[PDB]
Amino acid sequence: MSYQPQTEAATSRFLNVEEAGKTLRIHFNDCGQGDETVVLLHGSGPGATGWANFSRNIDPLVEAGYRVILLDCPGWGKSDSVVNSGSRSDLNARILKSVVDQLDIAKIHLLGNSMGGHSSVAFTLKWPERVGKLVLMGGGTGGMSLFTPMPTEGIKRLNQLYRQPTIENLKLMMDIFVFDTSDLTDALFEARLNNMLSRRDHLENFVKSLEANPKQFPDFGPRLAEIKAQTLIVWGRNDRFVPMDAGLRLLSGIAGSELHIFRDCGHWAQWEHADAFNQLVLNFLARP
Amino acid sequence: MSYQPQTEAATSRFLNVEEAGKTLRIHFNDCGQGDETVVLLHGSGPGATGWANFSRNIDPLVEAGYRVILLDCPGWGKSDSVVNSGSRSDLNARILKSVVDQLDIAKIHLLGNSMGGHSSVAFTLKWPERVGKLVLMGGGTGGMSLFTPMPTEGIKRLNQLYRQPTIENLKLMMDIFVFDTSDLTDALFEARLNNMLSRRDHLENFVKSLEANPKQFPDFGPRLAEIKAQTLIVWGRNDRFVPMDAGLRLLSGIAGSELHIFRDCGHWAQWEHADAFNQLVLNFLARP
Amino acid sequence: MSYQPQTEAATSRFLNVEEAGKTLRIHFNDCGQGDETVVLLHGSGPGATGWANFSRNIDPLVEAGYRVILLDCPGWGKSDSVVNSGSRSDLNARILKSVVDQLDIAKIHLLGNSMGGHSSVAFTLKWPERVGKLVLMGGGTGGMSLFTPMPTEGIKRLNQLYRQPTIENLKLMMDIFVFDTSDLTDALFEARLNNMLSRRDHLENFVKSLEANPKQFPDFGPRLAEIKAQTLIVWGRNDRFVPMDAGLRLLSGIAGSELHIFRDCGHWAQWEHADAFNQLVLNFLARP
Amino acid sequence: MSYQPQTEAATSRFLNVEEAGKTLRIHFNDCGQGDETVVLLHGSGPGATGWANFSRNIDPLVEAGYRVILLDCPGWGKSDSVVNSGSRSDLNARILKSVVDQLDIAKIHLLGNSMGGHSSVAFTLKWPERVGKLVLMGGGTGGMSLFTPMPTEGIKRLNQLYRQPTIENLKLMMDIFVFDTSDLTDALFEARLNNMLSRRDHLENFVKSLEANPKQFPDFGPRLAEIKAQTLIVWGRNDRFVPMDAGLRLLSGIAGSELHIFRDCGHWAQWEHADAFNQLVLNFLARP
Q: Could you write out the three-class secondary structure of chain A?
């Protein structure tokens, strides 16, 4: 019996949680019947959806027997809009702890991209006994780069996109965002544009929160030694939103870290080399 | 009496050089009559002229008594336009050899910028007898950076400006060019744009030369150990046109090097901190 | 129904080559009857037979069905002793071309470590047709390091060992190689010691070749872009013999390279991590 | 008249401090009578003293006319011995604050070396109003180096020297310090040897402090943005005790920071290039 493809509408559920004395409804997607579960977090992209980001990766995890949970972070997608001057990673970790408490599983595996990856690290710090295995891509710590000047051009273009939504500006930020532009298709363009224009509240909330607090990802350097679980970091050399050197710092921090670099890969690696990344992550998960 | 600021009109001089069996006219300026002599090169910018680049540096060098020669390479300023299919740096070196032979000066100090710095290094490789000192600002080696993606954004903006020169792309390039825009004034803009609109043959020649061969600057790494003269490097950290790592490479090669870096700096370093740069260079030159 | 591992005595083979009007006897090992042929190059450690370095990795490859040719370059083991004024790279490349020509195999996949890796690159340069896939382990490019002083202490202790051959020097050498010295056993110490004691002539030839040329491994920087085959690079972070940053430089040159770095690994990567390295190499080879 | 070179005996002073409910006696040297004050802090070498490290630099500073004070940290020189399981940097900050409060000078400029440099950073955080100008040499921040394995060569030999005292290891240490040992003279050898043999208590206290607490110096990364005064960092390229990259990290921390690197210079930088370092420091201090 060959595994049938999944659809975002089919797997959609919602849960309301009480945090900081306020209610918040979070959308999430659960698939698979396997005992072992894997958590996925989306990036910080405009109108980015958890199902949208991981369109290629959802399958090999489900044929391998892993039950997969995709978490739509608050302030993105179908989750309720929120304004926060505080750290995004801390809030994301709190929300994830709440949702896993409702789901009632103790040990989980984390795979987070960009902002979520940041939050992922945060989680492992302040409830370490929960996480089993850790994978990062294009993030893990927000700090000044050593050689490549900050702010990078990708961040400036993304802020330009938030301040004024425009399809041509979206085309620009996609083109800089991904190294190999040939694979880009108009279907993704229109879907992303529709999603981002539909939710104006998230965009204005992000702008206001950025104005409120200049920094959203604090430095986590001195505490990196605290992590004990095995970790793997994947990165792209031609990534322009965040420089390579940041990943190297993480390679120093964690005792068992192993880094994997592609020669010509953009920020959004899982799309560039889906097969290699999927096989590597599956082998890492199967590694005893 | 204080040394009067120099005027290009009074100090203008022209010379004839036979390169590749072709007659060419070269423009330059000479100031001072002291025994010690120095040559000043110019950058690779649109319509860049040595006088515009070195307005602040030109006075103290004359004040110290050094004879100064500001040299304009072909393809810029009043020199004859030319289309290149090989290595630009060697061609500049040959022209500089011809002009110094006509001046018949034995000992000479070289201070090159960006592509001009390239030329200087190439020159020093062939004729170590003639060169006494080297001061390199923002260039001197052609190679792929360790941690910064290529092609970098700055050269991309420069190329698109050459593709069609206009006021708004000039504003954008100037904004990215220098770290601070407060002290910037419109007089520099008007002078640069009038020098641009004066000649279009230079711009079209540059474009056809670039499209003829993708690389016009060779890699001098393996032989860079041949230089015996003491040298100094000044570099900019936040510079986006050429990454800092490449500069570090130069440091490793030469026996007597000294690297100097400013944090709040761009490509065009000498203008941003004129006092510190002049003090450092004069101290290095007077050093026995 | 796995076949028991083969012995050196059964797999020993001898070929004769002529170079520069001299007769050289080359001793190597050949195993497996598969169509695909993989050449294994020995390390630069004193008294290091090719079989010693790759004892663990032979079995999985031959079990997968790959034909393996483990080569001993001149100057080690049972091969004839030589003194070379030129580089080791081109010399080993020529010898390997000669031996494969006697073996008349159309295509090979190269696995190189330390010295061999260097030569491996040289091979791919000047006979591109024979090589299709390239794997490097902690070496393969000459040239001095940007961030690490030279001579690095590993090379210093290696030369000291060549000058004073003794057991305690071998102990210290093993101390710097492997991150954790616990895994080593006395059997390896005695085997390496008696092996290196058997052939002093190799020692005198190597040392007087060292006085022949201070630098024996040329840098391939400018030519690095000429390689067209896909490549995998494995490296160690705690490596002291060859600095980590050099590996990054290789990533720049190759068209589609992949860099893999382990957190706690020395010069001798294959021995320390067995399952992960074997699986990675097998997947990379099988992957088109 | 020529200003007389200073003598240790005439300028020696002893003052008292309270720390952790204990009375400590500290030895320092005072020179000059200028209103402006500069404080010099010594290194971490065994038996090293404030006067020894700055012997070549002390004279030009008083020649300019600035008042200068050489400080001996607890556990070094004639100061009372102490054991610290906690951080050293804060302890030196407290001692310097107390001594300057007794000497009651409002504005002070700091020059630090190795461990002292680290302490200097701490001071600028605690009492930013007092520090006017800041210069560092080879240190200032803890944490794992990105490109170099730890513990490195020099720190390991240093631990060896503290564990067991002798003269041959003293030659080895001087060999690791200096680029060229020909300049150094055995008079310094015997001075250092008698100094370190005279006081076994300091050696024992250092050993116990290291064995009690692994990390002596913390990382000050996240708060580096708090410093506002101008800084000058001087470093040596072949440094073996602490790699180059750390300096670059400080180059990111301070907004107005300035970096200077010598191509061929050991850890004990100021002795190796007396004239250049003195001239640079006088230029930096005189600059308004």
A: CCCCCCCCCCCEEEEEEEECCEEEEEEEEEECCCCCEEEEECCCCCCCCHHHHCCCCHHHHHHCCCEEEEECCCCCCCCCCCCCCCCHHHHHHHHHHHHHHHHCCCCEEEEEECHHHHHHHHHHHHCHHHEEEEEEECCCCCCCCCCCCCCCHHHHHHHHHHHCCCHHHHHHHHHHHCCCHHHCCHHHHHHHHHHHHHCHHHHHHHHHHHHHCCCCCCCCHHHHHHCCCCEEEEEECCCCCCCCHHHHHHHHHCCCCEEEEECCCCCCHHHHCHHHHHHHHHHHHHCC
Tell me the chain C residues in contact with residue A251 when contact means C-beta distances shorter than 8 Å: 237, 261, 263
The C-alpha of A252 sits at a distance from chain D's nearest C-alpha, in angstroms, of 7
D243 contacts C147? CB cut-off 8 A: yes
The secondary structure of chain B, three-state, reads CCCCCCCHHHHEEEEEEEECCEEEEEEEEEECCCCCEEEECCCCCCCCCHHHHCCCCHHHHHHCCCEEEEECCCCCCCCCCCCCCCCHHHHHHHHHHHHHHHHCCCCEEEEEECHHHHHHHHHHHHCCCCEEEEEEECCCCCCCCCCCCCCCHHHHHHHHHHHCCCHHHHHHHHHHHCCCCCCCCHHHHHHHHHHHHHCCHHHHHHHHHHHHCCCCCCCCCCCHHHCCCCEEEEEECCCCCCCHHHHHHHHHHCCCCEEEEECCCCCCHHHHCHHHHHHHHHHHHHCC
CA angle B123, B208, B192 (to 5 degrees): 75
Write phi, then psi, for D215 (nearest 5 degrees): -95, 115
Fold of B8-286: Rossmann fold (3.40.50)
Residues 6+ apart with CB under 8 A from D189: D167, D170, D171, D174
The Cα–Cα gap between C179 and C239 comes to 9
DSSP, collapsed to helix, strand or coil, labels residue D13 as strand
Longest dimension (CA), chain A: 53
Query: Token pair for residue B71?
Result: 């040299």
Report the greatest alpha carbon distance in chain C. Answer: 52
User: CB distance from B143 to chain C under 8 Å?
Assistant: yes
Do the beta carbons of residue A239 and residue A272 sit within 8 Å? no
Contacts of residue C195, defined as CB under 8 A and 6 or more positions apart, other chains included, come to: C47, C49, C52, C77
Write down the H helix ranges in chain D.
8-11, 50-53, 58-64, 88-103, 115-126, 153-163, 168-177, 186-198, 200-212, 245-253, 269-272, 274-286
With CA atoms as reference, the chain B residue closest to A241 would be B149
Method in brief: cryo-EM
Give the H/E segment covering residue D27: strand D22-31
Distance (Å, whole) CA D168 – CA D170: 5
The helix or strand, by DSSP H or E, that contains position C42, with its residue range, turns out to be none
Contact: C147, D147; criterion CB under 8 Å? yes
Rounded Cα–Cα distance for residues B24 and B95 (Å): 10
Token digits for B45? 């910018």
Q: Do B258 and D257 touch (CB under 8 A)?
A: no
Angle of helix C153-163 versus helix C167-177 axis, rounded to 10: 160
Nearest to B140 by CA among B20, B260, B284, B250: B250
Q: Are B146 and C144 within 8 A, CB to CB?
A: no
Q: Which CATH class name applies to A12-286?
A: alpha beta
Instruction: List the catalytic residues of A.
Output: 267
Q: How far is D243 from chain B (nearest CA, A)?
A: 14
> Shortest CA distance to C115 belongs to which of C11, C238, C237, C218?
C218
Residues C174/C48, Cβ–Cβ less than 8 Å: no
Q: Is A262 on the interface with C (CB under 8 A)?
A: yes
